[PDB]
Ligand binder design. Structure first.
Ligand SMILES: Cc1cc2c(cc1C)N(C[C@H](O)[C@H](O)[C@H](O)COP(=O)(O)OP(=O)(O)OC[C@H]1O[C@@H](n3cnc4c(N)ncnc43)[C@H](O)[C@@H]1O)c1[nH]c(=O)[nH]c(=O)c1N2
Length: 458
DNA sequence: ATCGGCTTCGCGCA
DNA sequence: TTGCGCGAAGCCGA
């Protein structure tokens, strides 16, 4: 019943007579998960129960309370949802390449399954796991509508090369999800969420008046809330998306990106629901292009350039152009600290930084601006990269994500873009100006909203 | 082929 | 505001 182009064999072996174990990692939800649906099947095709394992890692120390609380409040709800269908969830603390490896032994796992990520480190882990299990090891793309290694086989130069590949594959791969069959047969998150927050408090972004910057109430975490954010977008916001998606003063975005990043909702379900929805076709076309083409070319990009977060993976015309302007006199140079605390000369730029700092989700359009100004106002393209990756990943609820590196790459280095008119400092890299912003939206509204923060933020 | 078209440009202009 | 034509620009893919 499940399309088998979704499964890839990591380590062929003989099946053990124990349970099927889903090493969960990317797709932290219970519904609409091909990898957990696939685990139920081969557990049922062998009469063993299915179980799920998650592994907390030391990565959360590289970002903030905001995301750790987002993720873990998701797991507390997941965990209950899984128990309801009799599927135990066990949570591990440490390096997967050792902990998953042990778990597979201590539990006599018959077969191992994991969801798919393109980030370098998940493959580092897969290979320590492969190297230490005797059972078989299976990988299922639960994140993409069309499995990343099937849509294309090379790096897609631009979205217009990639778009027909994927759409010709859609009619075979866009299906409804079966329901999750309950089966028949470590630590507690409570303490895990407390130790982490006690460890992350020293970094928690505060204002001069001691209070935190972050506003936790713009995005309730979990599978439930995410489903409600999709249903709402589809009824109130999808008709307006094409027209109003570049207005930072509206709130016409879907606001799914923090759910999708953590897999708290399946992008395949959004597609299904949008397709079936009767709205302005131009909005459905413009929205599907984001959640389909751009989301998955971002996976295609990471999976095929391991240097995804470095200057080297820029296309050639862009490396040479930026090189030629390495010795240009930047108008302004800021340090990482100065960007962070919104101390530029450009009250629009600082505004988008206040929106990132306090909410954890910067508007789609401003994110572009945000990034191209860092290039202009740093001493080199490598610092621009570094500052951009650092701030994005540390402050976006949807950061540490393929969409993130591929998005910066587009802004700073023209991955998936094209060559525009040569400029000093920024080369042939597409330019964006404050007056360019002015004909698109009421700049001073934006500026006005977050003006009150910068005075207070230290 | 080899020429047309390319996410989300800026800017004059009506 | 908002829609259009133009400008500078490298490259894939039918
Ligand atoms: C400098 C910079 C940095 C980043 C990003 C872009 C830029 C220019 N992006 C991509 C994009 O800015 C971001 O995904 C949206 O703001 C997500 O918000 P909504 O769900 O509200 O988008 P919206 O409703 O407009 O679109 C819905 C979905 O489309 C996808 N999408 C939209 N724009 C995209 C883009 N340009 N590239 C890839 N996928 C895109 C996302 O999956 C998003 O969930 C990204 N994305 C992300 O999830 N995490 C990140 O940390 C970053 N980092």
């Amino acid at each position: 019943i499940m399309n088998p182009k979704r499964i890839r064999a990591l380590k062929s072996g003989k099946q053990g007579d124990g349970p099927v174990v889903y090493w969960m990692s990317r797709d932290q939800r219970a519904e609409d998960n091909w990898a957990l649906l696939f685990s139920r099947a081969i557990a049922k095709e062998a009469n063993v129960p299915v179980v799920v394992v998650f592994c907390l890692t030391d990565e959360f120390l590289e970002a903030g309370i905001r995301q750790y609380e987002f993720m873990l409040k998701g797991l507390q709800e997941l965990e209950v949802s899984l128990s309801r269908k009799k599927i135990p969830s066990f949570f591990l603390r440490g390096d997967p390449g050792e902990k998953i490896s042990r778990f597979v032994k201590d539990y006599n796992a018959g077969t191992l399954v994991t969801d798919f990520s393109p980030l370098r480190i998940k493959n580092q882990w897969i290979e320590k796991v492969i190297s230490g299990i005797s059972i078989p090891f299976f990988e299922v793309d639960a994140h993409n509508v069309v499995p990343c290694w099937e849509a294309s086989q090379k790096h897609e130069y631009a979205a217009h090369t990639f778009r027909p590949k994927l759409y010709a594959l859609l009619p075979e791969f866009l299906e409804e999800f079966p329901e999750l069959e309950p089966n028949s047969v470590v630590e507690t998150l409570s303490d895990v969420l407390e130790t982490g927050v006690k460890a992350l408090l020293p970094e928690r972004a505060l204002l001069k008046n001691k209070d935190p910057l972050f506003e936790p109430w713009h995005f309730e975490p979990g599978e439930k809330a995410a489903k409600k954010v999709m249903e709402s977008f589809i009824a109130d916001r999808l008709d307006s998306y094409g027209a109003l998606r570049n207005d930072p003063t509206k709130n016409m975005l879907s606001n799914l990106s923090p759910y999708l990043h953590f897999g708290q909702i399946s992008s395949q379900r959004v597609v299904l629901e949008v397709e079936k929805a009767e709205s302005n076709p131009g909005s459905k076309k413009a929205f599907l292009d984001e959640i389909l083409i751009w989301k998955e070319i971002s996976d295609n990009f990471c999976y095929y350039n391991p240097g995804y977060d470095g200057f080297e993976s820029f296309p050639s015309w862009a490396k040479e152009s930026l090189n030629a302007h390495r010795n240009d006199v930047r108008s302004h140079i800021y340090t990482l600290e100065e960007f962070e605390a919104g101390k530029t000369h450009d009250p629009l730029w600082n505004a988008s930084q206040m929106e990132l700092l306090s909410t954890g989700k910067m508007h789609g359009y401003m994110r572009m601006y945000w990034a191209k100004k860092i290039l202009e106002w740093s001493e080199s393209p490598e610092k621009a990269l570094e500052i951009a990756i650092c701030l994005n990943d540390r402050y976006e609820l949807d950061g540490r994500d393929p969409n993130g590196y591929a998005g910066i790459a587009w802004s700073i280095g023209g991955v998936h873009d094209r060559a525009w008119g040569e400029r000093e400092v920024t080369g042939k890299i597409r330019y964006m100006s404050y007056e360019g912003c002015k004909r698109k939206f009421d700049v001073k509204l934006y500026i006005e909203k977050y003006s009150a923060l910068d005075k207070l933020a230290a």
